[PDB]
């Protein structure tokens, strides 16, 4: 009776393993994406300082 | 005459000594058995009780 009443509690245990997998790789997708922006802006900013003119 | 009267006294003697004896040994038999019948049940009511809950699973 314990046992059958543990089937939601299975449910649960195992769609978290997979859900706890898929949430921390979406959020480590949102730092990669963001990191790369700041990637490309220090890209940038070494293009403005070759532009004399805004690098005065 | 009297032989009869020595053969009802020893066959007296070894009937009320064996019969008894063998069912004391019979009562501790049947107490094992029951342990063992009972445990060889639980076993089987665990196998189902483990079946119906691979079947929920």
Known sequence: ?56 | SQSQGIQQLLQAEKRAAEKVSEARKRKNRRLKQAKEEAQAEIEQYRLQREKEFKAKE
Do not use: F, G, H
């Open chain 1, 1 to 56: 009776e314990k046992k059958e009443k543990q089937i939601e509690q299975q449910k649960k245990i195992q769609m978290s393993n997979l859900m706890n997998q898929a949430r921390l790789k979406v959020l480590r997708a949102r730092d990669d994406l963001i990191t790369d922006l700041l990637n490309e802006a220090k890209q940038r900013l070494s293009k403005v300082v070759k532009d004399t003119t805004r690098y005065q």
